[PDB]
Write a protein that binds this ligand. Structure first.
Ligand SMILES: Cc1ccccc1-n1c(=O)c2c(C)c(C(=O)c3c(C)nn(C)c3O)ccc2n(C)c1=O
Ligand SMILES: Cc1ccccc1-n1c(=O)c2c(C)c(C(=O)c3c(C)nn(C)c3O)ccc2n(C)c1=O
Ligand SMILES: [Co+2]
Ligand SMILES: [Co+2]
Lengths: 382, 382
């Protein structure tokens, strides 16, 4: 059931911003590892004396990487005179964020009809303000409220390219990399207590619980058309294997963004390209499930995937799960940086045509049982 | 003239350590951009709860990338019980270094006969102690003294692989990249005042001035066999073009390491490989000199380089300079990170055979006049 109770008009995910120590090196690593193009910048060369911000794009997916310059470069500025292109940026906040959490997501940005109204309505409905609505060049409005931990939900609205003050990147510096990633499917937070997290966010957005069908309890919040999907997890304590949600909280110094799920228009091509680059600057993937898992896929999705398409999942280490409505193909990277905290999921969904509905096939929770069973079965092959 | 006045026995450059916010992303970017292999690690997977350190190698060149974990992981430790593999590491120092300077070199490490003796003699001769000699697994001794700004000169000595507590990297994660870089040729510091810098370092090392033949004054300190080369620059104020040394000091928040010169056994192959990767995660190079500069190379080095080898310099943007003793081929990257501070020089020297003597061909200061003249000449072609 979908009560369509969004308290303001929400459009789509707009971008994800990472707070970095050095935005150049993270952005270049991510660009090569994920096949994302350099498309905009805001830095010293554009007159920004406060922060360096570099935007990567793949299809509709936008990754922003920001790091502070020396505060001495902007010591004469005040907010009315700032050269920052993102007026919510603060040297002290950014340094404290990164020292506390390491590399990670600071902002989950969604495009809304009216960022001022969304901010007002959100805070009137319990949201903790983080940055008030600011109108940029009478063209775009940005505002921020707290989501969980030190992560903010950023609202952006456009009267009618990324943000004012950003410059398009010269073609020579903009190699047209593309491994097939096209948009952000969902963004997942880890918290110590799921109940209060859910009630807070569902409180100020009006997002509703999206229906499903180890070591965690989880729930998914969704916008009216269920295109914005914000799952949240809490750990389950006492298990024989320590909860990965608890390990995240310990190494992250508390709540924060756990994984970003990126939709590919061709998950086979995406994984082939990403795996060729794993050991030459790109991203590593979690261990592949045992061949038993792939021997068990025929009985589960053999009506959706050919044996040749099932063989390709096996070569690439892809997992498969299924709802009553659609099928999901997914795989997880190892952590993106030093700490066992944030990682990336690559996904592709099949089914639920009308365009495709959001969350088609679920999020893969059925793979816990399938993996465990596959692992006992591989142990029995022995 | 070489008075061979080293106060302790110095062998070779051993490694360069960068202090990072995220060592994983910088190390992966550098590995792909420079063609360096992942060869050792010290991190959570090796029992280090304090810092993540990843070592890249190309030939004899060793780049170490280190970032701190959350202090909470090691809050119960004391120095006698530490899990850090580099006992000089300190969370607070590393965070303050990176927040102050951004990404840059913390340690210039040289292998010495006896790190305890080198540290003792250095401090007895004016060096500011940074970290006392520590013996690791009764196998290697490390000690550190201040070099300039927040950069330390690190001594390492071996009784008889990198450091104890580091683990060799699994072959699967160790792709054998190689673009021809083989060793560190020199490491250059920028300071506000050259005189006191030179006197301090020459004071405690016994390193002597190495003889030569805009916007800077410079001098080179060398070890007995002149294989360790530590140039230092200060700005020249008042020039019509602002000194790049002064720009460095402003953005770096003071003195620090300006450039690392990496010797290639085949600078043509190195530059071809690095330039193919500039826009797909690697390093960018400074603008190429005008074709006039290459039309002027025949008259200057036409006895050393074929016209086909001179054409290859032109395709790759390589600069050429010459001493009374040897010839130098060199090129400079754009800054390695967000700030216009540290950059890399790729070099190859020809001449001075006996093995090759250090500094063969100088350091390229003759290219200031050659570039300027070439630029006026290209303007005249018009
Ligand atoms: C626990 C663990 C330790 C080490 C290596 C992998 C894993 N591991 C996963 O991490 C995992 C994730 C993140 C999702 C996910 O993407 C998700 C969930 C669940 N709920 N929602 C809303 C999502 O988006 C779905 C299945 C997963 N399986 C089966 C699994 O084994
Ligand atoms: C100033 C500047 C602004 C923007 C773009 C490039 C440049 N630029 C250089 O940066 C430069 C360097 C660093 C060296 C060097 O490597 C060095 C020196 C000098 N002394 N020692 C001991 C060295 O090792 C040699 C020649 C150079 N030329 C000719 C030049 O134009
Ligand atoms: Co997911
Ligand atoms: Co040089």
């Amino acid at each position: 059931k979908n009560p369509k109770s969004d308290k303001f008009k929400v459009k789509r995910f707009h971008h994800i911003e990472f707070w970095c120590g050095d935005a150049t090196n993270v952005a270049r690593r991510f660009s090569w590892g994920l096949g994302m193009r350099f498309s905009a910048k805001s830095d010293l060369s554009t007159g920004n004396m406060v922060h360096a911000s570099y935007l990567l794009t793949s299809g509709d997916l936008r990754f922003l990487f920001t790091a502070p310059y020396s505060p001495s470069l902007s010591a004469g500025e005040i907010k009315p005179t700032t050269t920052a292109s993102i007026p919510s940026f603060d040297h002290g906040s950014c340094r404290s964020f990164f020292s506390s959490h390491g590399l990670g997501v600071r902002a989950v940005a969604i495009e809304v009809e009216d960022a001022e109204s969304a901010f007002s309505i959100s805070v009137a409905n319990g949201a903790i303000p983080s940055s008030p609505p600011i109108v940029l060049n009478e063209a775009v409005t940005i505002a921020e409220v707290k989501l969980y931990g030190d992560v903010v939900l950023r609202y952006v609205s456009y009267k009618a390219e990324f943000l004012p003050g950003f410059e398009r990147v010269e073609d020579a510096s903009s190699f047209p990399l593309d491994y097939g990633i096209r948009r952000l499917d969902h963004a997942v937070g880890n918290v110590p207590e799921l109940g209060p997290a859910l009630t807070y966010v569902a409180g100020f957005t009006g997002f509703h619980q999206f229906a499903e069908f180890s070591g965690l309890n989880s729930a998914v919040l969704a916008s009216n058309d269920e295109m914005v999907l914000l799952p949240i997890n809490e750990p389950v304590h006492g298990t024989k294997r320590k909860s990965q949600i608890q390990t995240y909280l310990e190494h992250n110094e508390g709540a924060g963004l756990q994984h970003l799920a990126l939709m590919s228009e061709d998950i086979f091509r995406t994984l082939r390209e990403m795996r060729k680059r794993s050991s030459i600057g790109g991203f590593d993937f979690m261990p592949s499930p045992p061949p038993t898992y792939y021997q068990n896929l025929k009985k589960r999705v053999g009506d959706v995937l050919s044996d040749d398409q099932i063989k390709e999942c096996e070569e690439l280490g892809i997992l498969v799960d299924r709802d009553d409505q659609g099928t999901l193909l997914q795989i997880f990277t190892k952590p993106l940086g030093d700490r066992p905290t944030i990682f990336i999921e690559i996904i592709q969904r099949v089914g639920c045509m009308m365009y495709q509905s959001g969350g088609c096939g679920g999020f893969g929770k059925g793979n816990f049982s399938e993996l465990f069973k596959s692992i006992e079965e591989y142990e029995k092959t022995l």
